[PDB]
Design a protein around this ligand. Structure first.
Ligand SMILES: CCOC(=O)Nc1cc(-c2ccc(C)c(NS(C)(=O)=O)c2)nn2c(C)nnc12
Length: 126
């Protein structure tokens, strides 16, 4: 079975809309989402569909760009670090679960190289 997806809505969690979070949506997420290699990362890993009952035994902090997109569009975050951590969790989960050189790892590595380039240019808070 698949676990429930990560939280994307919680009225108890305090929220902000900042210029760094806007950059994460309008520059970072947009660039990565349109990459040719983005598609396996655009929704939670579907262990049922892939017949991978082991995935959620190994990966206990799942994350994906569909969840991140919802968090950004629905103003779930307080700060940019929360969102950057989600991206980093997504990449590291892929490297933990899969073998070096696997197609999915090469795809994640291409997205991560672009992510790092965009994050290096993160604007100062206004
Ligand atoms: C032991 C074999 O290892 C794997 O198959 N690994 C991985 C596979 C895929 C993957 C493939 C095909 C499809 C159709 C999907 N779609 S989805 C997002 O709905 O689940 C995902 N994503 N993936 C991610 C992220 N991280 N690892 C993997």
């Amino acid at each position: 079975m698949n676990p429930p997806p990560p939280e994307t809505s919680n009225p108890n969690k305090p929220k902000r809309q900042t210029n760094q979070l806007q950059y994460l949506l309008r520059v970072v997420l947009k660039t990565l989402w349109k990459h040719q290699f983005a598609w396996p990362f655009q929704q939670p890993v579907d262990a049922v569909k892939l017949n991978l009952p082991d995935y959620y035994k190994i990966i206990k902090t799942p994350m994906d760009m569909g969840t991140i997109k919802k968090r950004l569009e629905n103003n779930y975050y307080w700060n940019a670090q929360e969102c950057i951590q989600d991206f980093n969790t997504m990449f590291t989960n892929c490297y933990i679960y899969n073998k070096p050189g696997d197609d999915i790892v090469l795809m994640a590595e291409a997205l991560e190289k672009l992510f790092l380039q965009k994050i290096n240019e993160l604007p100062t808070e206004e």
